[PDB]
Design a protein around this ligand. Structure first.
Ligand SMILES: *[C@@H]1O[C@H](CO)[C@@H](O[C@@H]2O[C@H](CO)[C@@H](O[C@@H]3O[C@H](CO)[C@@H](O)[C@H](O)[C@H]3NC(C)=O)[C@H](O)[C@H]2NC(C)=O)[C@H](O)[C@H]1NC(C)=O
Lengths: 96, 93
């Protein structure tokens, strides 16, 4: 019974969250990509191997592969935007 | 081969590409195509003087093509553009 009476609020909240997801899709569509090393700024050169310095020390290098990765919670499509905004609304990982 | 502390090959020239530089890019492949004509002069140089050591072309791209071919020596941080012989010829004091 408590669920049934609530539904008017759920509908409005879902509609507003869908509109915000659409706005976020228009804003950050595909802009969350990044390379494994913070030196290559496009997928055309984010290929091959690169030297990684562990903990920022110059005397401890290690070879790593660089991959043009995407954020786990992105705004690529509407469903992804809705999921990301839900995770934000739960106040978890929203600063990231 | 003697007068060489390792295994070599006069059949062609070896190419060294640094780890940070991706082989197969447009810049490297174009640099790697016209440099194939350097092998003819590499062999011609050794024919006149058999007692000839490494002949190396250090590209501004980053790759170094040397003759005779020989396998490279932990991780490798060798860049031909930081070698003392490359720097002395890139500019005046
Ligand atoms: C840069 O890369 C190019 C692409 O591989 C090379 O160009 C190719 O060189 C081949 C070797 O000569 C050519 O083959 C013959 O070329 C002669 C010259 O006109 C012709 O008889 C025929 O085109 C061909 N003979 C055959 C197929 O029996 C290729 O035609 C030529 N072009 C291609 C493959 O598109 C360059 O040599 C290379 N640069 C350097 C410095 O090595």
């Amino acid at each position: 019974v408590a669920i049934r009476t609530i539904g008017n609020i759920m509908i409005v909240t879902t509609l507003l969250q869908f509109m915000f997801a659409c706005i976020g899709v228009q804003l950050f569509k595909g802009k969350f990509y990044r390379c494994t090393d913070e030196a290559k700024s496009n997928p055309e050169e984010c290929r091959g191997l690169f030297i990684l310095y562990k903990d920022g020390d110059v005397d401890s290098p290690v070879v790593r592969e660089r991959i043009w990765q995407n954020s786990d919670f992105n705004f690529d499509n509407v469903l992804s935007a809705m999921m990301a905004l839900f995770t934000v609304s739960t106040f978890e990982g929203w600063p990231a | 081969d003697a007068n060489f502390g390792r295994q070599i090959s006069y059949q062609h020239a070896a190419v060294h590409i640094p780890t940070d530089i991706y082989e197969g890019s447009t810049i490297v492949l174009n640099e790697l195509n016209w440099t194939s004509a350097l092998d003819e002069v590499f062999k011609k140089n050794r024919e006149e003087d058999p007692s000839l050591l490494w002949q190396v072309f250090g590209s501004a791209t980053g790759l170094a093509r040397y003759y005779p071919a020989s396998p490279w020596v932990k991780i490798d941080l060798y860049d031909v553009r930081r070698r003392p012989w490359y720097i002395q010829g890139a500019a005046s004091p």
